[PDB]
Design an enzyme around this catalytic site. Structure first.
Site, PDB file in Angstrom:
ATOM      1  N   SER C  33       0.722  -1.195   0.030  1.00  0.00           N
ATOM      2  CA  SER C  33      -0.070   0.075   0.006  1.00  0.00           C
ATOM      3  C   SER C  33       0.889   1.206  -0.049  1.00  0.00           C
ATOM      4  CB  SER C  33      -0.901   0.209   1.310  1.00  0.00           C
ATOM      5  OG  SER C  33      -1.873   1.147   1.043  1.00  0.00           O
ATOM      6  N   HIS C  64      -3.246  -9.670 -14.465  1.00  0.00           N
ATOM      7  CA  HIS C  64      -1.828  -9.167 -15.085  1.00  0.00           C
ATOM      8  C   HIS C  64      -1.097  -9.574 -14.041  1.00  0.00           C
ATOM      9  CE1 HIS C  64      -4.224  -6.651 -17.854  1.00  0.00           C
ATOM     10  NE2 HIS C  64      -3.453  -5.846 -17.956  1.00  0.00           N
ATOM     11  N   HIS C  86       0.645 -12.952  -0.576  1.00  0.00           N
ATOM     12  CA  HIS C  86      -0.042 -13.130   0.823  1.00  0.00           C
ATOM     13  C   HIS C  86      -0.638 -14.371   1.202  1.00  0.00           C
ATOM     14  CE1 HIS C  86      -0.970  -9.075  -1.154  1.00  0.00           C
ATOM     15  NE2 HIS C  86      -0.759  -8.633   0.281  1.00  0.00           N
ATOM     16  N   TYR C  88      -2.960 -15.636   3.011  1.00  0.00           N
ATOM     17  CA  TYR C  88      -4.331 -15.431   2.595  1.00  0.00           C
ATOM     18  C   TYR C  88      -4.775 -15.965   1.454  1.00  0.00           C
ATOM     19  CZ  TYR C  88      -4.398 -10.556   1.069  1.00  0.00           C
ATOM     20  OH  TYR C  88      -4.140  -9.708   0.480  1.00  0.00           O
ATOM     21  N   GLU C  89      -3.938 -15.671   0.264  1.00  0.00           N
ATOM     22  CA  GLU C  89      -4.114 -16.317  -0.989  1.00  0.00           C
ATOM     23  C   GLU C  89      -3.847 -17.801  -1.059  1.00  0.00           C
ATOM     24  OE1 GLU C  89      -5.720 -12.804  -2.510  1.00  0.00           O
ATOM     25  OE2 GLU C  89      -5.740 -14.853  -3.430  1.00  0.00           O
ATOM     26  N   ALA C 116      -0.618  -1.900   4.011  1.00  0.00           N
ATOM     27  CA  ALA C 116      -1.945  -1.418   4.616  1.00  0.00           C
ATOM     28  C   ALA C 116      -2.211  -2.239   5.747  1.00  0.00           C
ATOM     29  CB  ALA C 116      -3.146  -1.533   3.439  1.00  0.00           C
ATOM     30  N   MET C 219      -2.244  -8.061   7.480  1.00  0.00           N
ATOM     31  CA  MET C 219      -2.110  -9.549   7.030  1.00  0.00           C
ATOM     32  C   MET C 219      -0.904  -9.929   6.181  1.00  0.00           C
ATOM     33  SD  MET C 219      -6.176  -9.401   5.489  1.00  0.00           S
ATOM     34  CE  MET C 219      -7.395  -8.470   6.332  1.00  0.00           C
ATOM     35  N   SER C 220      -0.025  -9.034   6.160  1.00  0.00           N
ATOM     36  CA  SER C 220       1.400  -9.280   5.673  1.00  0.00           C
ATOM     37  C   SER C 220       2.448  -9.121   6.018  1.00  0.00           C
ATOM     38  CB  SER C 220       1.112  -8.639   4.051  1.00  0.00           C
ATOM     39  OG  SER C 220       1.300  -7.227   4.490  1.00  0.00           O
ATOM     40  N   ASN C 243      -7.329   2.106   7.818  1.00  0.00           N
ATOM     41  CA  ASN C 243      -8.385   2.036   8.531  1.00  0.00           C
ATOM     42  C   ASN C 243      -8.058   2.399   9.816  1.00  0.00           C
ATOM     43  OD1 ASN C 243      -8.943  -0.766  10.087  1.00  0.00           O
ATOM     44  ND2 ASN C 243      -7.968  -1.165   7.969  1.00  0.00           N
ATOM     45  N   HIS C 257     -12.754  -2.018   1.981  1.00  0.00           N
ATOM     46  CA  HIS C 257     -11.688  -2.177   1.390  1.00  0.00           C
ATOM     47  C   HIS C 257     -11.274  -1.260  -0.045  1.00  0.00           C
ATOM     48  CE1 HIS C 257      -7.688  -4.162  -0.195  1.00  0.00           C
ATOM     49  NE2 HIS C 257      -8.392  -4.270  -1.596  1.00  0.00           N
TER      50      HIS C 257
END
Lengths: 282, 272, 285
Positions: C33, C64, C86, C88-89, C116, C219-220, C243, C257
């Site tokens: 971010s 992409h 990440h 979570y992926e 972020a 989360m990263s 946030n 998001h």
């Protein structure tokens, strides 16, 4: 081994169910503690064993998917749920909730068994979930880990009003008007992966984290429900009072847990039925 | 990863060991810190390599093979694990559980375990002994409990309670022995929290863990303890404080003594 | 789990990249971010899609492929990861680790990372920069630390210490650059806690994390930092507060998001400028 909970596979399961029944449910119910007899109260019903639905997950006699009417409203009832401590996958737990969505479910109602951390709680009390702490989820075992299934929802779901405040309000009002509001609380549920009961040190830590009850289920299903836009009502039956003291002889016994659940089952079922009766109809 | 730790696989491994040795062990010992000690003093020892047992898990090379030493310590039959299985190494739940369930079938009633841990409690010093009176199983709470999966009912129940997990009478006796032998000033009691690892804990993590009610932190022990209690083996566990934790980003030796402690505890243990 | 991040596989990837570029990077940069435009402004840039590097992990933004960008930034040779991995992926530990270990062999001495994050600390404002001075790796304290499994001894030791994980001299320089350029008021330092995700944090979770001593949540980043520290790369990491965490359920405020993306888009110009000016004054050269 389980099938991915994507739109293709979930549609196949749902379409197979739609050939066995014309009932379009608007409320999905997962039977946990205190709801062992819920299936009895369902009128004009059709019981579909999980074993008869291809690609639907299997749990134990076989679990059943029960369609019918409850308090004049079309429902689908999971008798047999999927606990992560058994070794089930994320896709396995998610698929039934996503099937519910395609079948027409707008509201998920769920009960579970939980340990009472909050010292004001009594054995056999009902604690409506107003929030949760998903310890597995924070630690990289969130049910949504993996590619996002966009047909169902967004990559980063918010959980701000996960436990619908209007459903909680109504549940409290129904309890109070039927003379058991003194048994009803609201609180924060924390998920322990399990299957061990919590040590005294664990319980003490969990209480100090701002947790009222602890259990081994429910949060995964809630996350999948919220992810696909299903409103959620969830309530813990306090089946053990947590022991915080290491020198205490008191301890959680599974047979006493089950006994407390069965004792409260008529009341919990009556409560659920009277909530459904009062739900807004369009 | 390996073979399932069910009653049949564990029966087979136990039956082979019973052909290689007539010693029926009453006490199991896992050496974490004092490995070079304790395995020496066993009288009439029988060193049985892990490789000499099929289906029994094997340590990962390193030039040092694991061994299962049978013998007698202070008038009691024992079995010592020389070479542990840590979850940070990548071993499965069944791999870590199998050795403990073999101990049960061999006749073990008491498991004594030692490990290396970081001190969180501010009153601790390097070299201190910390008897575990409780634990916090962070991986267990986060869905990596060793008992996840189908329950092996022949060993224990689906939902085991962890009440008196660290037997209070064994802790009482261990304290009595330490103070009677001069080194009672070194002995504390406390809560052990498991960090899956293998990273050492950051200051912020140490601060969080301290405030959770934790006295020491380490990367082992809890998984075995859970399996032991599941199958009804009483547990005594002790951490040696091998690092004092720094709490803010701004800011070998006891092997012989812990060996002697364990030997003298076993001396005073009640025998059926 | 894909290809193991062992010395053999990592070397093969690094050698493939070295045939495509003559830039030996000193500084690695993972664009999270706020760093979208920083990648864009790399001088004399060679862009290598991840698709064109055998056994390099694959990630896309709606089709992409991400890119490895070599060039200079303030006169210093850099490698920029445009596109990240990440947990979570569903990427494996080896997948996330491999790019960092490749950076090590290419010559990278310092890793700069942005992300972020939700603001737990009640003094934080939307758009604030929170330099990481420490972390709480909740997945790691469980059994999901990126280093779980056989240790790759070629890159580092079995039990890495994380005592000065976020290099204190890099943090001091970053604060100084912000002060000297007139945006020191936007810059804080704090403890970052990893939520595996991909769910945003509930009010009860945020309250718990705040009481643990956490300033921001995301989360990263921590897995990469652990791999970087394991192989001896110095780390500078910054969370953009995208946030403000909601601590009470009785509130219509939620994390969305899109507004998170809007904060990153709006602060990207300043964050790019900050990173360029830090790089201008980094040590060794």
């Amino acid at each position: 081994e389980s099938v991915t909970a994507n739109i293709e596979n979930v549609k196949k399961v749902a379409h197979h169910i739609q050939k066995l029944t014309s009932i379009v449910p608007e409320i999905g119910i997962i039977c946990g503690s205190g709801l062992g007899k819920l299936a009895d109260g369902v009128k004009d019903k059709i019981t579909i064993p999980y074993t008869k639905i291809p690609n639907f997950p299997q749990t134990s006699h076989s679990g059943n998917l029960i369609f019918g009417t409850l308090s004049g409203r079309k429902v689908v009832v999971m008798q047999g749920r999927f606990h992560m401590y058994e070794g089930y996958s994320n896709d396995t737990v998610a698929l039934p909730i996503r099937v519910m969505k395609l079948l027409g479910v707008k509201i998920l109602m769920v009960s579970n068994a939980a340990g009472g951390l909050n010292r004001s709680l009594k054995l056999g009390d009902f604690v409506i979930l107003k929030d949760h702490i998903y310890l597995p989820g924070l630690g990289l075992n969130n049910i949504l880990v993996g590619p996002n299934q966009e047909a169902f929802g967004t990559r980063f779901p918010a959980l701000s009003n996960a436990y619908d405040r209007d459903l909680r309000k109504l549940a409290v009002q129904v309890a109070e008007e039927n003379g058991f509001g003194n048994l009803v609380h609201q609180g924060v549920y924390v998920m322990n992966g399990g299957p061990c009961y919590e040590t005294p040190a664990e319980c003490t830590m969990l209480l100090n984290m701002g947790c009222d009850v602890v259990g081994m289920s429910t949060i995964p299903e809630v996350v999948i429900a919220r992810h696909c836009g299903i409103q959620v009502f969830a309530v813990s039956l306090v089946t053990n009072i947590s022991v915080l003291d290491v020198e205490s002889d008191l301890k959680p016994n599974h047979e006493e847990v089950l006994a407390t659940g069965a004792q409260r089952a008529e009341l919990m079922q009556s409560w659920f039925e009277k909530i459904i009766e009062k739900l807004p109809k369009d």
